[PDB]
């Protein structure tokens, strides 16, 4: 529950700016960061627990 609560805090922080960008521009993007390298972002994800 502690790790999930920290994840929830970061999710809220991301969602605030996501909604702000949705209202100002028309679209908002939130990246779900996992335990991967910068080049691995291109590859798809099957099942993972986000960082």
């Amino acid at each position: 529950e502690v790790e999930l609560a920290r994840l929830k805090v970061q999710l809220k922080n991301a969602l605030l700016n996501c909604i702000i960008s949705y209202r100002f521009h028309g679209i908002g993007y939130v990246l779900v960061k996992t335990k991967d390298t910068l080049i691995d972002l291109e590859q798809p994800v099957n099942i993972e627990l986000p960082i």
């Binding site: 335990k35 994800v45 099957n46 627990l49």
Partner: protein, 111 residues
Amino acid sequence: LSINERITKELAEVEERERIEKQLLLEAERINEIDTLAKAHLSNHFNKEVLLAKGYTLKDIMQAQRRELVRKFVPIEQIKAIAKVSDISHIDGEILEQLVSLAKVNIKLRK
């Protein structure tokens, strides 16, 4: 015979101890490739320290890491083909070893 016989029986004991040592080295190789995969590819929340604090046997830790790695790398179709079922919650064993070998191949080709 006699004195030398008992010393050669102690030598047989040495053979047994060497067999145990080789078995430990095999454990080293297996469990260690597993731990390298776990650290390199899985979250910090699945660390052995926190899992042991939550109270899981180390074999449970290794099988959980293996299952997470298989779900992360091996596709669901490959799981449903090799393991014959989608759920991996009851597939620990030799089939799990095959699945983690496939996951190692997957990460090697991914790099």
